[PDB]
Design a protein around this nucleic acid. Structure first.
Length: 158
DNA sequence: CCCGGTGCCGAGGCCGCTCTTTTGGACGAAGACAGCACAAGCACCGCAAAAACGCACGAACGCGCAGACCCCCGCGAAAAAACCGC
């Protein structure tokens, strides 16, 4: 990864791409950017795969297997403005000494997101039909995330 | 003062019974024992852990800047209803 300052990186990319005809690719069934975690404290991108969940953070990357997710809680905060999504993980995530058996995410209730799943029509029909929607309309981010987590981990949302 | 005779007390006889000691001399070898399990507490060593303090670092908030928005300010009109009277 290069950092090219100035208004310059797009021209640099175009020349390189044209030189060897580089073809862009798309991975991860679904990604959610800029999610606020209360525990661990910080902001994380959540990338979901068939067998595993990735949390990408500026200082810490975590790979959680879908089997290690024991429980999903979807709980409204009493402030009537934020919604909490809570993951119980076993083994608990580690940052050094004390650990994170619970991941606490905080959403705004008014935050809406539109998301298309990165799946082929044959794989969707065979594995995910009736578990996931092919496209989610502009609904609240925490609902889409809770449904995706339910479909991929096969855990009931509490 | 005297006679007839009987039933009452004495020191002793004797009978059936209960209590006591004893059961030959010398020698050898082997085998199994000879208070215990149980009890609370003293004086002491040790590990697991608390409430709080000290340090490091990463991100979400403040600061700074250029932009879009509508609260705020100012204006004029109409008359509901508040303040006064008997």
């Amino acid at each position: 990864r290069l950092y090219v300052p100035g208004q310059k990186s797009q021209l640099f990319y175009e020349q390189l791409k044209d030189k060897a005809d580089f073809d862009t690719t798309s991975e991860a069934i679904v990604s959610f950017e800029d999610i606020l975690f209360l525990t661990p404290r910080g902001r994380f991108e959540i990338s979901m795969y068939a067998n595993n969940l990735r949390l990408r953070g500026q200082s810490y990357d975590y790979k959680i297997q879908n089997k290690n997710v024991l429980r999903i809680f979807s709980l409204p905060r009493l402030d009537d403005r934020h919604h909490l999504v809570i993951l119980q993980v076993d083994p608990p995530l580690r940052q050094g000494q004390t650990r994170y058996p619970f991941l606490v995410m905080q959403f705004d209730r008014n935050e809406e997101l539109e998301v298309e799943l990165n799946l082929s029509d044959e794989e969707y029909k065979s594995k995910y039909e009736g578990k996931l929607n092919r496209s989610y309309g502009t609904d609240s981010t925490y609902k889409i995330l809770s449904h995706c987590l339910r479909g991929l981990t096969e855990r009931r949302v509490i």
